[PDB]
Amino acid sequence: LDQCIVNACKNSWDKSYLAGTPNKDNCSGFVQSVAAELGVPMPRGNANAMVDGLEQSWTKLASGAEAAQKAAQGFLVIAGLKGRTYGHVAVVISGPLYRQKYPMCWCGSIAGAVGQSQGLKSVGQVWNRTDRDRLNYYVYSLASCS
Amino acid sequence: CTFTQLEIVPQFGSPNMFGGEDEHVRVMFSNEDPNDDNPDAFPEPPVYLADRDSGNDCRIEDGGIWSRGGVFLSQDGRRVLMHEFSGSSAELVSYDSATCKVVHREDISGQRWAVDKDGLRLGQKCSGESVDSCAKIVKRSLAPFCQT
């Protein structure tokens, strides 16, 4: 079911949602692009702004594990956490949890390539041990996959 | 005080260890990524530092995800400078090589960066990962990262 979404992550990857800043170096951009392809409405803004938006609009999940369940059901799931400086967001996909706790994701990052996941890293390998346990998972109420 | 980058490589005979050494300091990480035998970063502490001038070692027990070869050693062997990140935020953090205590930490979120004989350079309005692609570029002292 998550196909529709996976596709959306790979296509959204090479794109540049904002100006001359390619998605692979802009988490907010990458998410907006995936939401574009799927025609899902995502708050405008930078990372923090996106988190505030999701906080207010979106249904909030209780665990990374459930996040991967919803994601497996062809829903769109955004892992988000705010920062003092630059917050971060990532698209949660289905598959094995790292350390039985952190679900696989796709995200670009200004941090550099190390913070970039092409479905090969969990949110637990893009956020550090502290931030890793403070993530919020948000889900859109309609299964973008058919 | 000058920092030279320390290349981090697989150690033979220790199955998932990556590190590097020089005359003064050995640094080591363990790879816990199930899928990748050639990872770019280590998110699970400890980092092991060995002080070869004293024969002692110590562990750094917590820390941002560490970038393989964003590790740098100071000319005298007293400081170990490391690039660490989480989500979109990042930092450069200098540790004491004898005690593993953090001596200095600088938030560099949103910036491209580079470290060389000359010092530290940070940049914005970049077109790429290298600081040279950055429109605005700022040169920063590394003196607080390593002191006497």
Judging by DSSP bridges, how do beta strands B89-96 and B102-107 pair with one another? antiparallel
- The CATH code of the domain at A1-146 is 3.90.1720.10
| Contact call for A125 and B89, based on CB within 8 A | no
* B111 contacts B122 by C-beta, under 8 angstroms: yes
Using CA of residue B10, residue B14, residue B16, residue B17, what is the dihedral sign?
negative
Tally of domains within chain B: 1
Phi, psi of A54 (to 5 degrees): -60, -40
Give chain B positions within 8 Å (CB) of A98: 34
A:B CB pairs within 8 Å: 88
**Chain A within 8 Å of B116 (Cβ-Cβ)?**
no
Q: Tokens representing B38?
A: 């050639």
Distance, in angstroms, between B103 CA and closest chain A CA? Answer: 20
Give chain B positions within 8 Å (CB) of A83: 87-89, 109
Q: How far apart are CA A2 and CA A6, in angstroms?
A: 6
Experimental approach: X-ray
Compare CB distances from B109 to A25, A27, A86 and report the shortest one's residue.
Answer: A86
Cβ-in-10-Å burial (0-12, 13-18, 19+) of B86 comes to buried
CATH number at residue B45: 2.40.128.650
Q: List the resolution, Å.
A: 2.7
Q: What DSSP line would sit under chain A, residue for residue? A: -THHHHHHHHHHHS--SBTTB-GGG-HHHHHHHHHHHTT-----SSHHHHHHHHHHHSEEES-HHHHHHHHHTT--EEEEE--SS--EEEEE-SSPPBTTTB-EEEE--TT-GGG-EEEEEEGGGTS-HHHHTT-EEEE-SS-S--
**B107: domain range?**
1-148
Q: How far apart are CA B2 and CA B22, in angstroms?
A: 14
Q: What DSSP line would sit under chain B, residue for residue? A: --EEE---EEPTTSTTEEEEE-SSEEEEEE---SS-SS-SEE-SPPEEEEETTTTEEEEE---SEEEEEEEEEETTSSEEEEEEEETTEEEEEEEETTT--EEEEEE-TT-EEEEETTEEEEEEEESSSSGGGEEEEEEE--GGGS--
* A37 contacts A11 by C-beta, under 8 angstroms: yes
| Contact call for A129 and B43, based on CB within 8 A | yes
Question: Does the annotation mark A4 as catalytic?
Answer: no
